[PDB]
Design a protein around this ligand. Structure first.
Ligand code: HEM
Ligand code: HEM
Ligand SMILES: CNCc1cc(F)cc(-c2cc(C)cc(N)n2)c1
Ligand SMILES: CNCc1cc(F)cc(-c2cc(C)cc(N)n2)c1
Ligand SMILES: C[C@H](O)[C@H](O)[C@H]1CNc2nc(N)[nH]c(=O)c2N1
Ligand SMILES: C[C@H](O)[C@H](O)[C@H]1CNc2nc(N)[nH]c(=O)c2N1
Ligand SMILES: [Cl-]
Ligand SMILES: [Cl-]
Ligand SMILES: [Gd+3]
Ligand SMILES: [Gd+3]
Ligand SMILES: [Zn+2]
Lengths: 401, 401
């Protein structure tokens, strides 16, 4: 009844007893597996209890005076108001736990080092922008990146919500042409048209930092031009392919996701942007080489004079590796925090053993932990994993349009 | 009906074939176990009833004379003997469906072109050896490889099973060492011990072809040396790194899997070895670079003058790419069929399109289909997949020891 889980590189075996606690049913059934699909009223009370119980057991304080009392005041809070507010330390506990529970995040060896900015006393877009701009600058820290989340007011019935309209705080533009095809990032063509709608003027670049679209409850969104000095960027150069710089590639320093809904102990925070630091394959492999993203693979290969006329020359593999080298090298020369997939995955194996000893397992989504180049060269490839939903959690949510 | 998206292009289909999935796999809504490597007359009737129904849809004779006759026959044969016998064309179809249905096979574009050798009259291990030698000879075809399966007598009440104890027809020995290490392939230490225990004289090279351990019903397994000239091998060299030839590396031409069970209509064929041709990544990445296999990565990288002291130089990825290049070039030098992971994944995308029109879906195991290097450089990375079990099928079975 406890999944047997093997490591094929060493032969070791563990049991994931933590999977017993899974709550939100996944998409898989004994009949078919859907593990590769990307996006597959007083219920509040039961979610509330077991979160508080988590908090106190986490601090060796279960069955103790403050535990009894905190259970009453939440029960009393919901009685009158039909909802409740979190104690600051609890919001700190939920934020770090929701990170710890993220099955697809390969960087959770860092889950206990998280700076939480409480932004619950907020109203109007001009306020968020200041909260956002304090996060970004705190998080960037002149390239010495530091993990941070900012949590905006929770969801209330009978009132709009706080939402950021960009998938991330930093996004590059996506412009069509007299032939449809995109100049700039084709990922963000939909939000580029929403911004140009809301006043912004299109640049002509492949790396134009998009303006934020911030939306306060029931008031229509507001454009915001981010300060240029607050958007740290790293021009991409290769250590030994002098022509690489002339290709003119850049990526921003801060991966800061602003469209996921933080759920802690029953409450759902639709605006809660978190950030950390990049893994190099995220930029060098997915963002620049995906056929529907920047899709630079062929252009780098021509410049390295590789034979693009036969797929068996592995020219794709050769140029991809070098695009990744140029990312790691450009970020290191810029002194911005970045991690390569070999270092990241090995630390995740450490994280798994940490979590086995502490909690009897760890939800992990194999197809997202394994890197998108050189998979079987990393030890996560040879590690069987179990995937499920623990709470508190980061969740996806509808786009606010 | 599971909705499946291709993310590179944007397409959406619905896998309706999955609603027919028979035997249940490892996952529940509580937890996905997709990444695990290893997940009464009345029911032999329902299984065979379904297979016969399949065979007759395929010949466009669904609901006819022969169709009800064959059903009436099979229920008469089960009542009288407890089993029944496949007709030869039924056996050819069942074996081609089994390949088609195999979710972890990327080579299934070719499922219709399969040469089925009927050895269900085999009477001993010695005769079993002769069918196998013939199989290897036909399939090797002097390097112009052909896809083949030999089918030995089915499991039956009263007598034991035919078994090939070897996991493949062609395997390299793995001898343990004085310092605990292994010379040869460490995946084959166990079978190697058995061959010696059964009177084989071991060598001491790294690429020693193992003998065959063949088990007739209620017999000890019998040893058989494969004739040297029957096993085509390929010395490994690199197009440009001329020191590579000095590693002394070889692989064999024919991938011939011999430890799986073929199930057709509830009948079980515990010995039915099958073979096609290699994808270069199985050899270059897994067999040669896995830390628990030949583990040549570090030794290639030193020789390449790569910086092996930091992982951020991506020495592993660079060395592994040249190992794959070497495999492809060597097999083309020797005029031995081989397919690289870009061509193989591109033809698999075609298979999913063929199969969506023909059957409304295709059972696919994402983590096995995506190559172990260059994952997102291939179109299958960006394609969501539905994994499930269809019959006829190749199944795993315990080792007979
Ligand atoms: C500090 C360094 C970090 C690294 C290197 C890292 C790495 C990654 C990577 C590579 C992914 C895959 C995303 C994709 O490919 O689309 C991911 C997903 C995720 N990360 Fe982390 N991360 C870090 C910090 C954080 C922090 C601070 C949080 C929140 C507090 C977080 C929460 C998440 C979540 C919820 C996901 C899943 C989102 C999704 O499934 O789309 N990560 N992470
Ligand atoms: C003709 C070219 C073929 C190619 C390129 C190919 C490719 C592959 C690859 C790369 C794998 C994963 C192997 C591994 O990771 O160890 C695989 C698995 C498999 N192949 Fe194919 N194959 C071919 C022919 C065949 C044939 C002729 C059959 C049977 C008639 C077959 C049946 C299977 C099965 C049953 C599996 C999965 C076994 C398992 O689950 O471990 N293949 N194939
Ligand atoms: C909205 N999808 C979630 C997402 C998408 C994505 F492309 C990247 C990341 C991500 C986040 C953090 C904190 C670090 C990191 N290295 N990556 C998260
Ligand atoms: C029981 N393990 C199944 C297995 C293991 C394995 F290592 C390799 C292959 C395989 C088989 C064929 C016909 C072609 C090919 N290229 N690979 C199959
Ligand atoms: C369909 C497939 O599951 C999809 O492309 C996934 C695979 N694994 C991934 N892993 C990460 N980290 N990010 C992704 O976007 C994806 N895409
Ligand atoms: C545990 C992990 O699932 C295991 O190493 C798998 C991963 N995917 C694989 N995929 C293929 N095609 N072949 C394999 O041998 C493996 N090994
Ligand atoms: Cl990103
Ligand atoms: Cl093999
Ligand atoms: Gd020139
Ligand atoms: Gd030279
Ligand atoms: Zn699953």
């Amino acid at each position: 009844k406890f999944p047997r889980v093997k490591n094929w590189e060493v032969g070791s075996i563990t049991y994931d007893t933590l999977s017993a606690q899974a709550q939100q049913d996944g998409p898989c059934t004994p009949r078919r597996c859907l593990g590769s699909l990307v996006f597959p009223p007083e219920q509040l009370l039961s979610q509330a209890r077991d979160f508080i119980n988590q908090y106190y057991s986490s601090i060796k304080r279960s069955g103790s005076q403050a535990h009894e009392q905190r259970l009453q005041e939440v029960e009393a809070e919901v009685a009158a108001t039909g909802t409740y507010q979190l104690r600051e330390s609890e919001l700190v506990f939920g934020a770090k736990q929701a990170w710890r529970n993220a099955p697809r995040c390969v960087g959770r060896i860092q889950w206990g080092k998280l700076q939480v900015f409480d932004a619950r006393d907020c109203r109007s877009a001009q306020e968020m922008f200041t909260y956002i701009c304090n996060h970004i600058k705190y998080a960037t820290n002149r390239g010495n990146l530091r993990s941070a989340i900012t949590v905006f007011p929770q969801r209330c019935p009978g009132r709009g919500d706080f939402r950021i309209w960009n998938s991330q705080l930093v996004r590059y533009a996506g412009y069509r042409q007299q032939d449809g095809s995109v100049r700039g990032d084709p990922a963000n063509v939909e939000i580029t048209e929403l911004c140009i709608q809301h006043g912004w003027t299109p640049g002509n670049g492949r790396f134009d930092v998009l303006p934020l679209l911030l939306q306060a409850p029931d008031e229509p969104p507001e454009l915001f031009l981010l300060p240029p000095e607050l958007v740290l960027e790293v021009p991409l150069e290769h250590p030994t392919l002098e022509w690489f710089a002339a290709l003119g590639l850049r990526w921003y320093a801060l991966p800061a996701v602003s469209n996921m809904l933080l759920e802690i102990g029953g409450l759902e925070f639709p605006a809660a942007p978190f950030s950390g630091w990049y893994m190099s394959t995220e930029i060098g492999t997915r963002n620049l080489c995906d056929p529907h993203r920047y899709n630079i693979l062929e252009d780098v290969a021509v410049c390295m004079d590789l034979d693009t006329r036969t797929t068996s020359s592995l020219w794709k593999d050769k140029a991809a590796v070098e695009i990744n080298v140029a990312v790691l090298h450009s970020y290191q020369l810029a002194k911005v925090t970045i991690v390569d997939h070999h270092a990241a995955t090995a630390s995740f194996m450490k994280h798994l053993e940490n979590e086995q000893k502490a909690r009897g397992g760890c939800p992990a989504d194999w197809a997202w932990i394994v890197p998108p180049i050189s998979g079987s060269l990393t030890p996560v490839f040879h590690q069987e994993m179990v995937n499920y939903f623990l709470s508190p959690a980061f969740r996806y949510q509808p786009d606010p349009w």
